[PDB]
C-alpha cells in the first residue's frame, strides 16, 4: 500500500529487478561495485 | 679523409636512428593514453586531440634538431674542412 | 645500361639556372646542376605543382560560380562534402572568427593529396613521355613534387610565416616576446624572472623552430621512401627472368595498396597540424 | 688529427642521439599521464598543463646541456687545439 494522504491508502504492484560528464576512480572493479550496489538497491526498495 | 668521412656515415646513422627509436616508442606511449581517454570520455575526443598535438611538439623537438644536423653532415661537412 | 645508372637517373631533377656563361639554360648532368647555386629552379617541380593546383581550383570554381542552394548536381555534391568535412575539422579545434584558416585547410589538404597521387602512376611513364616529346634520351624529369625537399619546405615555411604573423597580429609584439620569454616559468622577484628568461627562451624557441621542419620532413620522408621502393621493385623486372617478373608484380601491387592509405593520411596530418598550430597562436595555452 | 676529428663526429652524434632517445620516451611517459588526468578531470586541465610544463623543464635540462656541448664541438673544437 502507498500512503497517498492520511485518509487514502492505495494498493499497488511495483516492478523491482528490471530497472555530469566525468568518471569515478572506481578503487575496486566497477563491475564488482555494480554487482554489490544493485543488491543494496533492491533491499532498500523492499524496506521502504 | 677516408676515416673522417666514413665515421660521419656512422654519426648520421646514430642521429637519425636513435631519434627514430625514441619517437616511435614515445608516440606509442602518448597515443595509448589518447585512445583510452577517447573511450572513457567519448564527448572529450576533440579536446584530447588538440592537447595531444601540443605534447607532440615537445616530444619531437630534440629529434628534429638531430634530423637537421644529420642532413647537414650528409651534404655539407664541418669536419672535412678541419683536415 | 646498369641498375645503378637506372636508379641514379630517377633521382635527378630538371634544373634551370646560371650556366658558366649565361642565366638561360638547363643542366645536362647532375654535377652541372649542383654547380647552379641557390639562384636556380627545378622546372619539373614547379610544372607539376602549379598545374595540379590550377586543376583543383578550376574544378572547385565550376561548383561555386553556379551553386544551386537546393538539390545538388554530382560535382557540387562532392565539393560540398569536402567543404563540410574541412569546416567541421576547423570548428573542433579553432574557436575564433579568422576567415583565412578554413580555405587554407581546404587548399592544403586537396593540393597535397593531388601532388602525392601521381606516385601511383607507373614510374617510367611520365619520365619517358617527356623524353619522347622533347626528342632527348638523357632528360631528367621527376613527376611527384612532394619527393623534392624544396617543395615540402616551401609549404611549411609559408605556414610558419602565417603562425608568426597571427601570433603578433592578435597578441601584439609584446605578447609574442612575452610567450617566448615569460612563459612557461614566471616569478615575482626581478632577479628570478631575469634568470628564467634564458630557460624559457630555450624551451619555447626550440619548439617553435621544430614546427616547420617537422611538417616538411614528415611529408618528404614518407614520399621519398615511397617512390624509392617503386624504383627498386622495377629493377626486378629489368632482370628479364620469369619467376622474378612474377614476384615483382605482387610486391608492386601490395606496395600500391599500402601507399594509397599513406597518400590519404599524409594530406590529413599536414592539414590537422596546420589547423592546430594556427589555433594555438590565437590564445595563451599555458 | 683525422682520428680526433672523426671521433668528434661520433661524439656529437652520441650526445644528441641519446638526448633525442631520452626526451622522446620521457615526454611519452609524462604526456600520457597528462591525457589520463585530463580525461578524468576536464575542469583541472588548465592547472594540470601548468604543472606539466614545470616537469618538462626538469626533463630536458641535461639533454639541452648535451646539445649545447654537441654544437660547440662542431663549430669549434676543444680537442683539435690540444693535440
Ligand atoms: Zn602562456
Give one DSSP letter per residue of chain C, joined into a string.
--HHHHHHHHT---EEE-BTTBS--B-SSHHHHHHS-SSEEEHHHHHHHHHHHHHHHHHHHHTTTT--SSSPPHHHHHHHHHHHHHHHHHHTT--S--SSHHHHHHHHHHHHHHHHHTTSS-TTHHHHHHHHHHT-SS------GGGSHHHHHHHHHHHHHHHHHHHHHHHHHHHHHHHHHTSS---SSHHHHHHHHHHHHHHHHHHHHHHHHHHHHHHHHHHHHHHHHHHHHHHHHHT--TTTTTHHHHHHHHHHHHHHHHHHHHHHHHHHHHHHHHHTTSS---
Cβ contacts of residue D71 below 8 Å, gap of 6+? B69
Q: How many CA atoms lie within 13 A of C19 on its CB side?
A: 10
Query: In chain C, which residues are last before a break of more than 2.5 Å from C to the next N?
Result: none
Q: How many CA atoms lie within 13 A of D50 on its CB side?
A: 7
Under 8 Å CB pairs connecting chains A and B tally to 6
Distance C283 CA to ligand 1 centre (A): 8
Q: Using CA atoms, how far apart are residues B54 and B50, in angstroms rounded to an integer?
A: 7
Burial of D35 (0-12, 13-18, 19+ CB in 10 A): buried
Using what technique was this structure determined? cryo-EM
User: Closest approach of chain D CAs to the CA of B7, in angstroms?
Assistant: 6
Please report the resolution in angstroms: 2.8
* Residue C220: other Cβ atoms inside 10 A: 19
Q: Residue written as cell 661524439?
A: D11
Whole-Å CA distances, C213 to A48, B55, C80, C216, D61: 69, 17, 32, 5, 23
Chains touching D by CB (3 or more pairs below 8 Å): A, B, C
Q: Residue written as cell 523491482?
A: A16
What is the longest distance spanned by two Cα atoms in chain D? 61
Q: Which of C34, D71, D77 is nearest to B83 (CA)?
A: D77
A5 three-state secondary structure: strand
* Residue D32: other Cβ atoms inside 10 A: 22
Q: Are C274 and C216 in contact (CB under 8 A)?
A: no
* Residue B29: other Cβ atoms inside 10 A: 19
**Is D64 in Cβ contact with C202 (below 8 Å)?**
yes
Distance D45 CA to ligand 1 centre (A): 14
Q: Using CA atoms, how far apart are residues C30 and C140, in angstroms rounded to an integer?
A: 9
Report how far apart the first and last C-alpha atoms of chain A are (Å, whole number): 11
Q: Are C215 and B53 in contact (CB under 8 A)?
A: no
The catalytic site residues of D sit at 60
**Alpha-helical runs (H) found in chain D:** 2-40, 45-75
Cβ contacts of residue D49 below 8 Å, gap of 6+? B51, C285, C286, D34
Q: Are D32 and B29 in contact (CB under 8 A)?
A: yes
Q: Looking at the complex, does the CB of residue C211 fall below 8 Å from at least one CB of chain B?
A: yes
Q: What 8-state DSSP symbol labels residue D41?
A: -
Beta partners for residue A10, in sequence order: A2
User: Closest approach of chain C CAs to the CA of D53, in angstroms?
Assistant: 7
* Residue C33: other Cβ atoms inside 10 A: 19
Q: Which of C191, C166, C169, C196 is nearest to C181 (CA)?
A: C196
Print burial letters for D2-11: b (CB count within 10 Å at least 16), e (below 16). Answer: beebbebbee
Q: Using CA atoms, how far apart are residues C200 and C203, in angstroms rounded to an integer?
A: 5
* Residue C41: other Cβ atoms inside 10 A: 14
- Chain C CA closest to residue D48: C286
Burial of B36 (0-12, 13-18, 19+ CB in 10 A): middle
Amino acid at each position: 500500500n502507498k500512503f497517498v494522504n492520511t485518509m487514502t491508502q492505495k494498493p499497488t504492484v511495483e516492478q523491482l529487478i528490471p530497472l555530469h560528464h566525468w568518471d569515478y576512480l572506481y578503487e575496486p572493479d566497477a563491475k564488482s561495485l555494480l554487482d554489490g550496489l544493485l543488491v543494496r538497491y533492491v533491499e532498500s526498495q523492499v524496506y521502504q | 679523409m677516408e676515416t673522417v668521412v666514413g665515421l660521419t656515415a656512422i654519426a648520421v646513422a646514430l642521429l637519425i636512428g636513435l631519434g627514430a627509436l625514441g619517437t616511435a616508442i614515445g608516440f606509442g606511449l602518448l597515443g595509448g593514453k589518447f585512445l583510452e581517454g577517447a573511450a572513457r570520455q567519448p564527448e572529450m575526443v576533440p579536446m584530447l586531440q588538440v592537447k595531444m598535438f601540443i605534447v607532440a611538439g615537445l616530444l619531437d623537438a630534440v629529434t628534429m634538431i638531430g634530423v637537421g644536423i644529420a642532413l647537414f653532415f650528409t651534404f655539407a661537412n664541418p669536419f672535412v674542412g678541419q683536415i | 645500361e646498369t641498375a645503378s645508372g637506372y636508379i641514379q637517373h630517377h633521382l635527378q631533377n630538371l634544373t634551370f639556372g646560371r650556366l658558366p656563361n649565361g642565366d638561360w639554360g638547363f643542366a645536362h648532368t647532375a654535377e652541372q646542376a649542383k654547380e647552379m647555386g641557390f639562384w636556380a629552379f627545378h622546372v619539373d617541380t614547379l610544372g607539376w605543382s602549379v598545374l595540379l593546383g590550377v586543376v583543383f581550383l578550376f574544378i572547385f570554381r565550376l561548383a561555386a560560380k553556379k551553386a544551386t542552394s537546393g538539390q545538388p548536381g554530382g560535382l557540387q555534391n562532392f565539393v560540398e562534402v569536402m567543404v563540410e568535412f574541412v569546416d567541421t575539422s576547423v570548428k573542433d579545434t579553432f574557436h575564433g572568427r579568422n576567415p583565412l584558416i578554413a580555405p587554407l585547410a581546404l587548399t592544403v589538404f586537396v593540393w597535397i593529396f593531388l601532388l602525392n597521387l601521381i606516385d601511383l602512376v607507373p614510374v617510367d611513364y611520365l619520365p619517358m613521355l617527356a623524353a619522347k616529346i622533347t626528342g632527348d634520351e638523357h632528360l631528367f624529369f621527376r613527376a611527384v613534387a612532394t619527393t623534392d625537399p624544396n617543395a615540402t619546405l616551401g609549404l611549411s615555411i609559408s605556414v610558419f610565416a602565417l603562425i608568426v604573423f597571427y601570433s603578433i597580429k592578435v597578441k601584439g609584439i609584446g605578447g609574442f616576446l612575452g610567450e617566448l620569454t615569460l612563459h612557461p616559468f614566471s616569478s615575482k622577484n626581478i632577479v628570478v624572472q631575469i634568470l628564467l628568461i634564458p630557460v624559457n627562451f630555450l624551451l619555447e624557441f626550440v619548439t617553435l623552430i621544430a614546427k616547420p621542419v617537422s611538417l616538411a620532413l614528415r611529408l618528404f620522408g614518407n614520399m621519398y621512401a615511397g617512390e624509392l621502393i617503386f624504383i627498386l621493385i622495377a629493377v626486378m623486372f629489368g632482370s628479364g627472368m620469369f619467376l622474378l617478373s612474377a614476384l615483382g608484380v605482387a610486391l608492386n601491387w601490395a606496395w600500391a595498396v599500402f601507399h594509397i592509405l599513406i597518400i590519404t593520411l599524409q594530406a590529413f596530418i599536414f592539414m590537422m597540424l596546420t589547423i592546430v598550430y594556427l589555433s594555438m597562436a590565437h590564445e595563451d595555452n599555458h
